[PDB]
Amino acid sequence: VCKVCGQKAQVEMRSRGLALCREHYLDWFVKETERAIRRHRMLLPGERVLVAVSGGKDSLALWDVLSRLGYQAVGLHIELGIGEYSKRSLEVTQAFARERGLELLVVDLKEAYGFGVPELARLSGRVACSACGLSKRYIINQVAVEEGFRVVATGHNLDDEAAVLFGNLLNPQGPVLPEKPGLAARVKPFYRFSEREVLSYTLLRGIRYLHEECPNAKGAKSLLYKEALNLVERSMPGAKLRFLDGFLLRECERCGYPTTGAVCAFCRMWDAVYRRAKKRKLLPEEVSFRPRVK
Amino acid sequence: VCKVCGQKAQVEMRSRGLALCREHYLDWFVKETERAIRRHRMLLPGERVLVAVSGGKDSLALWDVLSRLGYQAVGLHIELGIGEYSKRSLEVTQAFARERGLELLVVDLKEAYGFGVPELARLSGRVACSACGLSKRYIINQVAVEEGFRVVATGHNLDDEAAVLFGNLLNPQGPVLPEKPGLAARVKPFYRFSEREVLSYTLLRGIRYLHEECPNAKGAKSLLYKEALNLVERSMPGAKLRFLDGFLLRECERCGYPTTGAVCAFCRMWDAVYRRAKKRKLLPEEVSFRPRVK
Ligand code: SF4
Ligand code: SF4
Ligand SMILES: [Zn+2]
Ligand SMILES: [Zn+2]
Ligand SMILES: [Zn+2]
Numbered sequence: 079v080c081k082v083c084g085q086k087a088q089v090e091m092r093s094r095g096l097a098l099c100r101e102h103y104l105d106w107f108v109k110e111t112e113r114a115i116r117r118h119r120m121l122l123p124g125e126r127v128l129v130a131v132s133g134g135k136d137s138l139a140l141w142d143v144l145s146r147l148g149y150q151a152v153g154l155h156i157e158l159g160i161g162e163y164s165k166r167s168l169e170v171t172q173a174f175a176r177e178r179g180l181e182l183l184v185v186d187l188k189e190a191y192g193f194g195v196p197e198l199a200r201l202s203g204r205v206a207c208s209a210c211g212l213s214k215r216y217i218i219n220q221v222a223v224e225e226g227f228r229v230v231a232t233g234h235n236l237d238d239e240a241a242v243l244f245g246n247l248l249n250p251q252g253p254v255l256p257e258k259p260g261l262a263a264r265v266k267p268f269y270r271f272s273e274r275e276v277l278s279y280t281l282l283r284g285i286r287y288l289h290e291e292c293p294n295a296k297g298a299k300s301l302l303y304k305e306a307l308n309l310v311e312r313s314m315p316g317a318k319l320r321f322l323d324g325f326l327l328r329e330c331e332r333c334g335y336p337t338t339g340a341v342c343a344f345c346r347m348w349d350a351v352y353r354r355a356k357k358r359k360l361l362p363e364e365v366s367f368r369p370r371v372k
Numbered sequence: 373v374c375k376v377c378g379q380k381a382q383v384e385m386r387s388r389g390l391a392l393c394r395e396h397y398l399d400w401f402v403k404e405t406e407r408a409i410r411r412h413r414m415l416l417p418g419e420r421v422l423v424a425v426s427g428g429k430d431s432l433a434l435w436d437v438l439s440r441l442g443y444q445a446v447g448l449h450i451e452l453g454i455g456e457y458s459k460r461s462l463e464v465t466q467a468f469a470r471e472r473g474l475e476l477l478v479v480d481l482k483e484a485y486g487f488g489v490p491e492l493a494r495l496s497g498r499v500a501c502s503a504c505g506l507s508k509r510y511i512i513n514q515v516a517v518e519e520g521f522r523v524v525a526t527g528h529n530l531d532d533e534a535a536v537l538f539g540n541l542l543n544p545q546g547p548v549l550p551e552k553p554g555l556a557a558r559v560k561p562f563y564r565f566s567e568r569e570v571l572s573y574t575l576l577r578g579i580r581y582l583h584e585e586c587p588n589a590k591g592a593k594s595l596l597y598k599e600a601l602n603l604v605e606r607s608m609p610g611a612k613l614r615f616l617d618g619f620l621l622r623e624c625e626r627c628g629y630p631t632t633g634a635v636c637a638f639c640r641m642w643d644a645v646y647r648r649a650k651k652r653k654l655l656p657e658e659v660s661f662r663p664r665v666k
């Protein structure tokens with residue numbers, strides 16, 4: 079029975095030994111989010127915040143909640159140029175913002191830099207997710223800083239932090255990443271939430287999100303870790319949360335942004351990519367890579 | 373191809389990127405065992421050692437190797453009184469010692485204490501494995517000390533240590549446990565070995581072991597952890613070993629053996645068991661529990 083009203087429970091959280099009807103689950107989820115924000119001084123009451131929005135359940139849900147709590151939540155979507163996948167992601171995301179009258183910023187990777195994640199992978203030599211991850215972190219930050227956002231929110235959740243933690247133990251982040259001179263802050267307001275929890279909010283709130291996952295991968299290390307931890311969690315609710323809980327610079331020559339070297343990894347990657355595009359005659363020889371500067 | 377001779381490989385160890393024919397796998401396993409013994413000063417050349425032998429693959433294999441290396445390896449088996457299971461375990465174990473002319477010590481739990489692990493569980497209030505585990509640790513030690521063994525060896529392996537480590541991270545031991553006044557030392561010479569590795573040695577050496585597992589459990593926490601870690605290991609060989617590696621008193625009033633209280637957990641358990649047997653008229657009222665003393 080629902081713990082708040084005593085009518086039919088629509089969501090059960092064995093992790094928390096808690097059951098709620100639709101309305102009170104939705105109420106709890108939102109309130110629990112505002113709790114994380116306050117417990118870690120993540121945001122200011124109506125603060126502008128740049129939300130990294132993929133079109134997936136977590137980031138749409140997050141965009142949804144932060145609005146509800148009255149923050150000025152601007153979304154940033156990055157069209158990564160991964161085929162129909164990147165196309166659908168953008169569509170969904172745009173559909174979402176359109177319906178809610180939220181403002182959406184979009185960076186199209188091929189229009190801005192000349193190559194989509196696939197060609198970027200082939201040319202940089204990195205695995206697609208390495209190139210892609212690096213490209214996502216850089217551009218979100220740059221967009222943030224360029225547009226005056228003190229802070230940036232991602233929809234990373236309990237499953238993510240625990241999977242990451244587990245990955246490190248096998249192969250040797252905090253709710254708030256502190257603002258620095260060339261770095262906006264990164265808050266994860268869904269850090270305590272289960273994936274199943276976020277998915278529940280998303281379904282009960284009627285949010286249409288992109289069900290398709292990205293073609294690669296499909297061999298993700300993160301996925302392997304999540305299965306193994308879910309296999310445990312199923313039989314031992316609260317395992318992930320216990321696990322987690324238990325445990326707890328220079329300016330780039332090309333672009334001005336923070337790095338521990340002369341040239342940042344991002345500039346270093348697009349530099350080489352451009353160089354090799356030239357050698358293979360894909361770019362004119364007199365073209366160079368000019369990153370936007372701080 | 374086998375790394376030592378170049379003929380057909382019979383065992384592959386992706387964990388180690390190593391392949392060996394039967395003869396050279398057997399040679400490697402034995403030599404790797406003698407390595408663990410020396411690297412951690414576990415044993416002396418012909419030292420007497422009490423081997424906890426269940427009749428399973430690990431302890432028979434271990435009993436086999438320690439003999440081969442010329443240690444005086446006496447086995448200890450505990451008939452725990454768990455139905456046909458405890459019966460078969462004893463048979464297998466006896467068959468093994470008989471064929472190799474090794475000496476086997478046996479403690480039958482019902483003959484010594486009056487109850488088998490099942491009744492022991494019901495009467496102590498503990499889950500069978502809690503009563504059983506406590507009973508096994510106590511009796512092995514007592515037998516060791518009573519018989520003048522400085523040291524005791526168990527067949528616990530990499531899978532076991534990693535499963536245990538994982539269990540603690542979710543729900544908050546060393547190769548050598550140091551001899552103390554009332555405690556013989558405990559060496560695990562198979563601590564670096566995979567389960568699959570030990571099983572391989574066992575099969576290639578032609579050792580007949582007890583394939584049946586114990587009726588409870590069948591819900592083991594240790595089992596859950598091992599699956600989840602194997603699920604990872606399959607896709608990422610060396611995960612367990614990385615995981616592991618990365619990370620790295622008073623006398624009892626009744627019985628004289630070490631404890632952190634007045635009466636040790638073992639004496640405390642059999643005491644209550646006897647008391648409740650009396651109340652239920654299963655023991656005469658004038659009978660008391662007299663544990664053997666140091
Ligand atoms: S999966 Fe790899 S490639 Fe596909 S989006 Fe996430 S990171 Fe970029
Ligand atoms: S499983 Fe539980 S009960 Fe069966 S033997 Fe191992 S410990 Fe004793
Ligand atoms: Zn309710
Ligand atoms: Zn740079
Ligand atoms: Zn060989």
Ligand SMILES: [Zn+2]
Binds near residue numbers: 639
């Ligand atoms: Zn005692």
